Symmetry: C3
Subunit: 30 residues, 3 copies
């Protein structure tokens, strides 16, 4: 339940990390 | 107490999400 | 253990906050 929903959370935070780095790269390659 | 301060936390993270999207938009409309 | 690893976490989130502000400043001073 809980430990799982924390893992589901680490999932989306890993994404969110990657997405912000991509958005920052793309601003610089614009 | 705890469940409340977690909700107080989801509050500020929602903001923080919006603020970063606004800062990224504004860089592109600059 | 837990309270400590939460504090270790607040550590890295403070950083992460500063790092994103620096990356945004530097895009604007580019
Ligand atoms: Cu993070
Ligand atoms: Cu987030
Ligand atoms: Cu944050």
């Amino acid at each position: 339940g809980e430990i799982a929903a924390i893992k589901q959370e680490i999932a989306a935070h890993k994404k969110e990390h990657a997405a912000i780095k991509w958005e920052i790269a793309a601003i610089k390659q614009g």
